[PDB]
Each structure stands twice: as structure tokens, then as C-alpha cells.
Design a binder for this molecule. Structure first.
Ligand SMILES: [Mg+2]
Ligand SMILES: [Mg+2]
Ligand SMILES: [Mg+2]
Ligand SMILES: [Mg+2]
Ligand SMILES: [Mg+2]
Ligand SMILES: [Mg+2]
Ligand SMILES: [Mg+2]
Ligand SMILES: [Mg+2]
Ligand SMILES: [Mg+2]
Ligand SMILES: [Mg+2]
Ligand SMILES: [Mg+2]
Ligand SMILES: [Mg+2]
Ligand SMILES: [Mg+2]
Ligand SMILES: [Mg+2]
Ligand SMILES: [Mg+2]
Ligand SMILES: [Mg+2]
Ligand SMILES: [Mg+2]
Ligand SMILES: [Mg+2]
Ligand SMILES: [Mg+2]
Ligand SMILES: [Mg+2]
Ligand SMILES: [Mg+2]
Ligand SMILES: [Mg+2]
Ligand SMILES: [Mg+2]
Ligand SMILES: [Mg+2]
Ligand SMILES: [Mg+2]
Ligand SMILES: [Mg+2]
Ligand SMILES: [Mg+2]
Ligand SMILES: [Mg+2]
Ligand SMILES: [Mg+2]
Ligand SMILES: [Mg+2]
Ligand SMILES: [Mg+2]
Ligand SMILES: [Mg+2]
Ligand SMILES: [Mg+2]
Ligand SMILES: [Mg+2]
Ligand SMILES: [Mg+2]
Ligand SMILES: [Mg+2]
Ligand SMILES: [Mg+2]
Ligand SMILES: [Mg+2]
Ligand SMILES: [Mg+2]
Ligand SMILES: [Mg+2]
Ligand SMILES: [Mg+2]
Ligand SMILES: [Mg+2]
Ligand SMILES: [Mg+2]
Ligand SMILES: [Mg+2]
Ligand SMILES: [Mg+2]
Ligand SMILES: [Mg+2]
Ligand SMILES: [Mg+2]
Ligand SMILES: [Mg+2]
Ligand SMILES: [Mg+2]
Ligand SMILES: [Mg+2]
Ligand SMILES: [Mg+2]
Ligand SMILES: [Mg+2]
Ligand SMILES: [Mg+2]
Ligand SMILES: [Mg+2]
Ligand SMILES: [Mg+2]
Ligand SMILES: [Zn+2]
Lengths: 47, 95, 62
RNA sequence: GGAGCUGUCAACCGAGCGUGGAUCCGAGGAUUUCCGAAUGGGGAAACCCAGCACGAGUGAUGUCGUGCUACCCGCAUCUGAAUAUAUAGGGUGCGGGAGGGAACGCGGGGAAGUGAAACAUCUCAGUACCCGUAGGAGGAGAAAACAAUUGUGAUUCCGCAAGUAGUGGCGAGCGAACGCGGAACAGGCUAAACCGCACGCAUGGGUAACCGGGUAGGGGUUGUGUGUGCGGGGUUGUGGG
RNA sequence: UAGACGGUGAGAGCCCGGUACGCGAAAACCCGGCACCUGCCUAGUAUCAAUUCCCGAGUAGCAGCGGGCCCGUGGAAUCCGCUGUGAAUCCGCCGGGACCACCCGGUAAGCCUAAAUACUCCUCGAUGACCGAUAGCGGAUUAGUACCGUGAGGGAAUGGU
RNA sequence: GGGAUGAGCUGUGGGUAGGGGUGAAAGGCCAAUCAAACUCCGUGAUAGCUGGUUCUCCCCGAAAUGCAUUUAGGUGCAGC
RNA sequence: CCGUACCCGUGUGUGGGCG
RNA sequence: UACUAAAAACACAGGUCCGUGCGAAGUCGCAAGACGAUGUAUACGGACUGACGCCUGCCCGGUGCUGGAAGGUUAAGAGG
RNA sequence: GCAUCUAACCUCGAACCCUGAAUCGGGUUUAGGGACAGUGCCUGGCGGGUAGUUUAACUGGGGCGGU
């Protein structure tokens, strides 16, 4: 899965851009803390 | 649907002990087996309009009886032995 | 635990088969893992045991 | 219905009832102790002990009668711990479940004796038994089907196909399907694309729109995109809006 | 239209209950009809063109280990379970017994569906080249009784003036 | 005859259950049964073994050998 | 049952006491 | 060794060895959980020996157990 | 591979709340451990702990010997 990261994550990306992580990092650190969301419909909102 | 005490008290016991107690104004009744001394007291007091000093109860097992088809038990009974107040009027049992 | 609380997936029953083809009963349990799932972000965690298939899907959150 | 009757082992009596219609037969209702899923709590089933409310009773405690009071689930409302959002939990009100039943069904678990003249693969046998769970039946059922150059057209069940093709320590044994003949026949409902309505989230004030389409002005920011609910619409394989 | 059957003091169509046949239901339940009621439709149709979007996912597929099919893993197809990996939406995907090409067939991963099928604790109505009291139900008889067993359980015998 | 203030005896109430229990250990005991209780069910288990298998007469009438055999008191084929 | 007790609870009076 | 064996058999106090650093080891349970133990190495479990006295010699080849990992062998997986 | 980290996961460490009665449980916080452990699937080893069984016949009885 691909996460659009709303927060700024060091050596991982800035606001808004989409970045793919190895699925444990995302669901155990990024989604719980609001750093990223899963990319389903957010591309239209960003663009 | 209103209950009355003439159905707690079933019948008088007719026996030589019953007469012996009748001599001293003590009356033995067959009562409903699920009744207790207090409702026997209230029941006798308002049926015969007497003052009940004490009610003594005894549960009596039904006699087991041999017969050609097997053994059958009679009814289990409960006697209530009621002694009235020392001077209250005797009840008229008509025999 | 061999039952998932989301999809209800349970153990399958089959046979261990030896080289001599003696078959004895065994189970195929689902890969059930304990998760501390939340309903809304920051909410109270609730301990579930769910299969790795549901964990791979988005069926539970942490 | 119409003259006897008060059931039967099972006679004897006793006491009565009945043409002002009994006994008896059919249907509906009333009553329906206690135990039992048993469910107020407890319990050695048929017993014990309550609480609340309303009545009855006593001079008053005693006592009596009638209801309600288990647990879980679902729904709806109130509240919302640690702790804030909140949730867990708690309160209330409605509903429902529980247990039983001879056989038949479906799903799941699943022996051994036995047979293999031993025995482990195999058999027995997916049998016995067990678990879950029904219903008057159930399951299956509307082609990700078969078939093979013309084809058939949901499922089920019966007869064949056939003890055949096969499958088997190719041992003991196990054993289809294609297709054919019959019983009976029946097909439907669901998302999106897409479109309105409401809610929540993001963005902008002449950027732009927007105010059912066209024609002109007016208003002069409530549009647009999105997630969630309500509807429409569609449901097909000669592919189907 | 009655000679079914049984009873009656011994083989009864005509003695009795009945039988053929014909009537019969306050009510309850069942069945059906008419209303009332509820729901759907009153706006689409046809053609053109194929530029765009739609077809149900941790599913299919693949790999492992199993199960099941005639198939006892075999080259193992189809189907099912668990583990891992993991799609695509028709210029897709699946099947046609490894597999490939072509061709044919079908549209999985949502649900519902009568009838033909199974069964009889139970209710009526019949029947028997069935039994007739050591038989037939264990049980014509106190029968799941007596009795035996702590218990689960086992379990009789006994008909005829 | 042994112990008889003790590792004592005993009551009441309770717990451990069948490849299991419990055992100061004898394979002891687990309801007069124990090298795996009992009951029901699979079940009319299976037994190359033992026993039993019921009226009559008429005709004919064996074998106890060979071969093979996880076979030798069974069985197949041959012989009769 | 007689004689003599004890325990728990209830009601009605009298007396004085504490609030 | 209930019901042919009471013994020299078992147990025992004492001994030694091994295990166990703590929801220990061990055990009962699929698990949760429980006992161990409301104990903590002077403790707990297992094994053998069996008061006490004098003692308990040789063998590490075999088989176990303990420790080690240089090398050989090897499963799935990956690889292709 | 090694190390570190913490956020999965783990804790029969502690406190608090559900809780009125709770050495259960759950939740919250904290103190640690920590991508290890445990568990699923696959896989090698070990495995009388358990289970089902086999363990020939001839034979001057059987065994042993021999065949
Ligand atoms: Mg992953
Ligand atoms: Mg007295
Ligand atoms: Mg008394
Ligand atoms: Mg007598
Ligand atoms: Mg569960
Ligand atoms: Mg199976
Ligand atoms: Mg088997
Ligand atoms: Mg999977
Ligand atoms: Mg009547
Ligand atoms: Mg009635
Ligand atoms: Mg009760
Ligand atoms: Mg109860
Ligand atoms: Mg709060
Ligand atoms: Mg039921
Ligand atoms: Mg077998
Ligand atoms: Mg055999
Ligand atoms: Mg045999
Ligand atoms: Mg159906
Ligand atoms: Mg046909
Ligand atoms: Mg919709
Ligand atoms: Mg006749
Ligand atoms: Mg597979
Ligand atoms: Mg197979
Ligand atoms: Mg589809
Ligand atoms: Mg469909
Ligand atoms: Mg259906
Ligand atoms: Mg049907
Ligand atoms: Mg019928
Ligand atoms: Mg009948
Ligand atoms: Mg009989
Ligand atoms: Mg008895
Ligand atoms: Mg002596
Ligand atoms: Mg002596
Ligand atoms: Mg002595
Ligand atoms: Mg011995
Ligand atoms: Mg005994
Ligand atoms: Mg045995
Ligand atoms: Mg059988
Ligand atoms: Mg001759
Ligand atoms: Mg012969
Ligand atoms: Mg006195
Ligand atoms: Mg002896
Ligand atoms: Mg002796
Ligand atoms: Mg010692
Ligand atoms: Mg030591
Ligand atoms: Mg342990
Ligand atoms: Mg030793
Ligand atoms: Mg010794
Ligand atoms: Mg020595
Ligand atoms: Mg050495
Ligand atoms: Mg692992
Ligand atoms: Mg063995
Ligand atoms: Mg066997
Ligand atoms: Mg021999
Ligand atoms: Mg010899
Ligand atoms: Zn799951």
C-alpha cells in the first residue's frame, strides 16, 4: 500500500507527497500517529 | 379470587386422643399441609370467633399399603392441635 | 487462539501423512495474532486475536 | 344426542342426578398446586428463603392473596470511569433466546472390531458415535455448466449408462462421468458508471462560479472535490448502462 | 346402490351395531372469492458513433501442506481448507484432465427460490397365503412395572368358568 | 498373636476416573470383577477352533494321496 | 400438662429523666 | 499382595548425584490456569543408596549426559 | 550480520478506574523487555513418552541345533 504523508517524516518525505513503506512501519507508526493516510481518494484533493 | 380460612381448615380429627383433648378444650383439625401455625391461628380465630392460645402442628406421613397391583401410599396429612384461651368459649363442632 | 474475531476463520482439519502414508489427524490453524485495535484515532485499545489476512487488509487499526 | 347416568381394575354398597335434556360426543374458553429450560435467591427436582408493589388481616408485629424481580442477545434512549475527546461500564424501556421431540436434513469432528487368511497403505467407513444447527421437509438451484464442429441449456430425485472407464500393497477391494429415458419444472433480487437530497471534511472571493436548458438582466461567496447515509438506475454473456 | 365387518346362547344380507347410499356444523381451524388495503407504471422510444467510465479482493492465480473426487500425488485437471505471495474489470477473467497455440463455452469471489425427493413420535381409514400368550412389542397381565445394580444401566413372569 | 500418643485409629463432608486415578510399590486398589473397571452402543465383532444342524425311502458311493502354501489339524488344483 | 424459667420481637399505658 | 505370600520386599531417618535463578525445574491441562509455593538454592523436583561405624578402589573404550564449534554432512526457504 | 531505537508484540513489575464487596478480567498510565520471544504455516532432528502391529514353518511334543 501507498501512504500520502500529511506530516513531515525525516528521510521519508515532506507534506503531501506519496511514499511507499514496508507495511509494518505504516500501520504501526504512521497511521496511528496521524503522520500518513492511505492513498485512495486524496490525490484529487491534493491536485 | 378472595381466599378464606375455611379452606385452610379441612376437617376435625375424630379419634380417642381427639376426644381426650376435647375434654380439656383442645381441638385437632386436619389442615392443608402447606399451612403454618400463624395462619391456623388466624383462621380458627375468625372461623369460630374464639381466642386461640396456641396451635401445635404435626406432619403425618401417609400409610403405605400393599394391594394386588403394588404398594400405594395414602395421603400425607397435617394435624393442627389448637388450644384456646383459658376461659374462651368452646367451639360447637356438632358431634 | 485459532479463531479470528473479524472473519471468523477457524482451523481446518486434515491429515499429517507419513512416508509410509500413515495419516493421522491434525489441524491447520489460521495465523492468528493479537492486535490492540482502536475504533477511532486515539481511542481506547481493545485486545483482539485476528488473522494475518485481516491484518494485511485494513480490517483492524492500531 | 335423546334416556339413562354417577370412568375403570371391581363386586359390594351408600348417596343422588336426569326429557325443565343428565350421562355421553365435538369445539372454544376458565381454572391450572409444586417441580422441571425453570428464570427472585437457594436447593438433595417436586423443597427452603425472600425483595418490591398492590390488596386482605391484627391492637401491632406475626400471617394471607395477586403480580413483578434470572442471565444473555438485539434495538432504542439517559449517563460517560481512569481521562479530555471519548469508550468500557452503568440506568431505563421494549422485543427475542434458552428447553424438549421417533425418524428424515445440512455443516463440522470422527473410531474400532472387521476384510486384506498376518499387517501398517488400503478396508471397514466418512459407518458408529459426537458437536453445531434446522425445516416441514431440508440441502441443491439459475452456468466462471456441459459438450465437441449441427449441440444441450437452473436444481433435485428415479432408471440406465455400469460393476463399465478407471482406480487399488493393481492386493482385499473401491468405482465414476458423458449421455439417454422419466418425475417435476421457474426464475429472481443485490454495487458501480451515473444522477439528485441531507450530513461531515478541504478550498476562494470577483478566483470564479452558482441560481433547470436557451434568450436578457438581476443576486453578487455558497460553488467545487470528496467520505458517509437516502433514494433512483442497472443486474447481463449475441456481453451487460 | 346394503352378501363389508362385528355382535347376538352354534356358519345371520333380512335380530342388533352397522354396511351401500344419502344428509349433517353454533363455533373453531383450514380452504377459496369478493371487497377494503398495499405496492408498481403513467414517460420514454428509436437510431447514430464508439472518445471516455462500470461489472462485487486479501478474492482469483501461483507456491507449500492437506482434504475430496474413479484418481491411494501421479504429468494432476476441476473442487475445498490453512500458510505465504498476491492480481486484473472485458483489448478482463475462468473452464474445456500437465502445458502451449488456436478454437469453443461461461461470466467466480453477494443473496433468495416452488415442484418432483426423505421421514412418521402422532391422527384417521383400511389391509395382511403376518403372530396368536415360550409367539407377536420387553410389555394382551402392576410393564419399562416387580426385581437387580451405588450408578449409567439391565429387566421379567403372569390371558381363557 | 502385632500395634495400641502415633508414619495411630475413626466419624462426617469433600477431591482425584479408565491408558486415567491412586499406590510406604503387592501390578496392589479404583463398588464381592483389574497386566487397563463398569454400562450402553459399533454388534448378530471376529474365531483356519469346539459344539450343534430336526421326516422317509430308492440308486451310486469315496478320501485320508500328489503338488503348492506365513503351510503342516486350514486351503487351492489334481487324484478318488 | 403442672411448677418455675430464659430469649427475640410487637403494641398499649404510667412514672420520671435526656434532647 | 481386601480374598493362599507380612517377608529378607516397600518406606524410613541419613548419604550422594543430577536438575531448578523463579507465574523455576517438574507435573496436570490443547490453552488459560493450577500445583510446586503464598516456597526462592540451608529451597523445590528427579534418581540411586538406605540408621550408625570403617570405608567406597581401577576403567570415559561402548551407551548416555554436559560443554565446544574448526571442519564434513543436510531439510524447508531462497536461487534459477 | 552487528549495534542502537520504539511503535508492533510481550510483562504474574507498579499505580489508577470499571469496583459497591475483587490476589479474576479488562481498560488507562507508567516501568521494563523488544522486533527478540510467543504463535501460524513450512521444515530437519529427536522421540518406547504413546500407539498400532510384526516377530515363519518343518520338527518322532515344543525350544535349542539343523533345514
Ligand atoms: Mg508484510
Ligand atoms: Mg406449646
Ligand atoms: Mg413440630
Ligand atoms: Mg399391613
Ligand atoms: Mg474465541
Ligand atoms: Mg476431513
Ligand atoms: Mg485407519
Ligand atoms: Mg490466504
Ligand atoms: Mg362435554
Ligand atoms: Mg377445553
Ligand atoms: Mg427457582
Ligand atoms: Mg435454581
Ligand atoms: Mg471522558
Ligand atoms: Mg432448539
Ligand atoms: Mg484397522
Ligand atoms: Mg486381517
Ligand atoms: Mg482371520
Ligand atoms: Mg431451501
Ligand atoms: Mg435428463
Ligand atoms: Mg446505494
Ligand atoms: Mg359376517
Ligand atoms: Mg493451493
Ligand atoms: Mg486429492
Ligand atoms: Mg462477477
Ligand atoms: Mg450471481
Ligand atoms: Mg437457496
Ligand atoms: Mg423441494
Ligand atoms: Mg403418510
Ligand atoms: Mg391405525
Ligand atoms: Mg411375550
Ligand atoms: Mg435401588
Ligand atoms: Mg492384644
Ligand atoms: Mg509382644
Ligand atoms: Mg502393646
Ligand atoms: Mg511381579
Ligand atoms: Mg474389588
Ligand atoms: Mg486394552
Ligand atoms: Mg460393523
Ligand atoms: Mg454299492
Ligand atoms: Mg478339492
Ligand atoms: Mg409453663
Ligand atoms: Mg493375601
Ligand atoms: Mg497372610
Ligand atoms: Mg532422603
Ligand atoms: Mg544441587
Ligand atoms: Mg514450566
Ligand atoms: Mg544417578
Ligand atoms: Mg535398597
Ligand atoms: Mg564405585
Ligand atoms: Mg569420551
Ligand atoms: Mg516460527
Ligand atoms: Mg508398544
Ligand atoms: Mg487391528
Ligand atoms: Mg512349529
Ligand atoms: Mg525335537
Ligand atoms: Zn480474519
Amino acid at each position: 500500500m501507498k501512504l500520502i504523508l500529511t506530516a513531515d517524516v525525516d528521510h521519508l518525505g515532506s507534506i503531501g507527497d506519496t511514499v511507499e513503506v514496508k507495511d509494518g512501519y505504516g500501520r504501526n507508526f504512521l497511521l496511528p500517529r496521524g503522520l500518513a493516510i492511505v492513498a485512495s481518494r486524496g490525490a484529487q484533493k491534493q491536485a | 379470587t378472595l381466599a378464606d380460612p375455611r379452606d385452610i381448615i379441612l376437617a376435625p380429627v375424630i379419634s380417642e386422643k381427639s376426644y381426650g383433648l376435647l375434654d380439656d378444650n383442645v381441638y385437632t383439625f386436619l389442615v392443608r399441609p402447606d399451612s403454618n401455625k400463624t395462619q391456623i391461628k388466624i383462621a380458627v380465630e375468625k372461623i369460630f370467633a374464639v381466642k386461640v392460645a396456641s396451635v401445635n402442628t404435626a406432619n403425618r406421613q401417609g400409610k403405605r399399603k400393599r394391594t394386588r397391583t403394588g404398594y400405594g401410599k395414602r395421603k400425607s396429612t397435617k394435624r393442627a392441635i389448637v388450644t384456646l384461651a383459658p376461659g374462651s368459649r368452646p367451639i360447637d363442632l356438632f358431634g | 487462539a485459532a479463531v479470528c474475531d473479524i472473519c471468523g476463520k477457524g482451523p481446518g482439519f486434515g491429515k499429517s501423512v507419513s512416508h509410509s502414508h500413515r495419516r493421522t489427524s491434525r489441524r491447520w490453524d489460521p495465523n492468528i495474532q493479537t492486535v490492540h485495535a482502536v475504533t477511532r484515532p486515539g481511542g481506547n485499545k481493545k485486545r483482539l486475536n485476528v488473522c494475518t489476512s485481516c491484518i494485511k487488509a485494513g480490517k483492524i487499526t492500531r
